[PDB]
From Swiss-Prot:
May be required for DNA interstrand cross-link repair. Also required for checkpoint mediated cell cycle arrest in early prophase in response to mitotic spindle poisons. Possesses beta-lactamase activity, catalyzing the hydrolysis of penicillin G and nitrocefin. Exhibits no activity towards other beta-lactam antibiotic classes including cephalosporins (cefotaxime) and carbapenems (imipenem). It is found in: Nucleus. It comes from Homo sapiens. Binds constitutively to TP53BP1. Binds CDC27, which is itself a component of the anaphase promoting complex (APC). Binds PIAS1. Induction: During mitosis. The mRNA encoding this protein contains an internal ribosome entry site (IRES) in its 5'-UTR. This 5'-UTR generally suppresses translation while specifically promoting expression during mitosis, when cap-dependent translation may be impaired. This is DNA cross-link repair 1A protein. Belongs to the DNA repair metallo-beta-lactamase (DRMBL) family. The gene is DCLRE1A. Expressed in brain, heart, kidney, liver, pancreas, placenta and skeletal muscle.
Length: 341
């Protein structure tokens, strides 16, 4: 059965609620982004209205075969009317096509559902600036002060400089980047751009990228692995055995692999700066875990919430344990006392 924090009071709406069958009283299902914990349940057999971004709708149609007549894409930053209720989709700074959703309830209440997001000061100048928000359904993935990580721009500088140095020292080195979902495309696109290469990948992954409206994509990606010196592999294969096996398949073109695993947070964050990050090495294979996050750090989350000043916060992540829930509630009260709302 559908949990309460996926239901929007005073409407017929649910958010990211496709794995519970026919939800009682739901007239329109919203989908914030194309990540499997959120789309779980969707297919060609779905016959209710799904509301989403244009990019998410391309992925529903091509990857899951949802029929066109049930996909309702909405433009961003535009007031739209859905089953008699005004809504707005805003950029979530998560993966491609990911949105936050503002609902303007008929009784005067305003609700913001962040979906999954990486808070940023740029959000303080969207359509949020223009009215009060009463309730916030908040992505609390990293809601504890131990979660620090660098900006995306610092992480990409490290990756580009690392790859460019390695391949300039050894033109026979292959670079490999792990992936298992959409998101984090800058990692592999920035490395390919510095090296003067396209990114090579499976036909299934190429299909997924072609759904994303990324400009000049036919220029940056390919299925011809033999012409590429940056390869994308499933995340599961980014280990010494998987990589040794891949290097065999390349037929003596290469004699070294430099591989990247973009994780979210790892506890090497609490002791080490990005500049100081080192790989795991075995023989002619090196693996770098890089802290490229598409979720708010603690400080970024705190800043957003203290700017927005909601009357009530409903967490959507880490809600399954009493210890997690109690910890989160204590930070919310701190933020409110420090800021004065
Ligand atoms: Ni996500």
């Amino acid at each position: 059965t559908c949990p309460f924090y996926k239901k929007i009071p005073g409407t017929g709406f649910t958010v990211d609620a496709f794995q519970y069958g026919v939800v009682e009283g739901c007239t329109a299902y919203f989908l914030t982004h194309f990540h499997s914990d959120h789309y779980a349940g969707l297919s060609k057999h779905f016959t209710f209205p799904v509301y989403c971004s244009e990019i998410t709708g391309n992925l529903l149609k091509n990857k899951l075969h949802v029929q066109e007549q049930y996909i309702h894409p909405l433009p961003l930053d535009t007031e739209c009317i859905v089953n008699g209720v005004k809504v707005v989709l805003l950029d979530a700074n998560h993966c491609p096509g990911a949105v936050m959703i503002l609902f303007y309830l008929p009784n005067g209440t305003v609700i913001l559902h962040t979906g999954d997001f990486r808070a940023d000061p740029s959000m303080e100048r969207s359509l949020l600036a223009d009215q009060k928000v009463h309730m916030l359904y908040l992505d609390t993935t990293y809601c504890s002060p131990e979660y620090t990580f660098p900006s995306q721009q610092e992480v990409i500088r490290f990756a580009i400089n690392t790859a460019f140095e390695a391949v300039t020292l050894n033109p026979h080195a292959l670079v490999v980047c792990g992936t298992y979902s959409i998101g984090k495309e800058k990692v592999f696109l920035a490395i390919a751009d510095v090296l003067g290469s396209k990114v090579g990948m499976s036909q299934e992954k190429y299909k997924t990228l072609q759904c994303l409206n990324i400009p000049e994509i036919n220029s940056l990606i390919t299925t011809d692995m033999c012409s590429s010196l940056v390869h994308l592999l499933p995340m599961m294969q980014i280990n010494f055995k998987g990589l040794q096996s891949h290097l065999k398949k390349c037929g003596g073109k290469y004699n070294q692999i430099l591989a990247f695993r973009p994780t979210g947070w790892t506890h090497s964050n609490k002791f080490t700066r990005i500049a100081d990050v080192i790989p795991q090495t075995k023989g002619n294979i090196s693996i770098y875990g890089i802290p490229y996050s598409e979720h708010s750090s603690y400080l970024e989350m705190k800043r957003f919430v203290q700017w927005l000043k909601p009357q009530k916060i409903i967490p959507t992540v880490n809600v399954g344990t009493w210890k997690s829930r109690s910890t989160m509630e204590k930070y919310f009260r701190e933020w409110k006392l420090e800021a004065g709302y």
